[PDB]
Amino acid sequence: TSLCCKQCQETEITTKNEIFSLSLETLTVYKASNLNLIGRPSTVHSWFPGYAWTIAQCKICASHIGWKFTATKKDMSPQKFWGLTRSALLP
């Protein structure tokens, strides 16, 4: 169930336990680890209306794994989640 950065191999980014389905490839998970955020949130072209995105890269190898999505309104659930490019992860 560990999902690790495919590039550096050793760095766990999330687990299968964290996977969920947002009502509307890209894996969406409630929680992730060992990612650094680059820049500030943007709503431009957001794949999840009502959320803004921030680039998220592996803390070890700087590979771009996906994005942190943050809610633009307080009344939403989850207030944030991660959308991760499946091919960037092992398994």
Ligand SMILES: O=C1CC[C@H](N2C(=O)c3ccccc3C2=O)C(=O)N1
């Ligand atoms: O929700 C998202 C995440 C970011 C993603 N995105 C990209 O992957 C990209 C590549 C090049 C130029 C502009 C973009 C962009 O907005 C995108 O289109 N929407």
Ligand SMILES: [Zn+2]
């Ligand atoms: Zn890595």
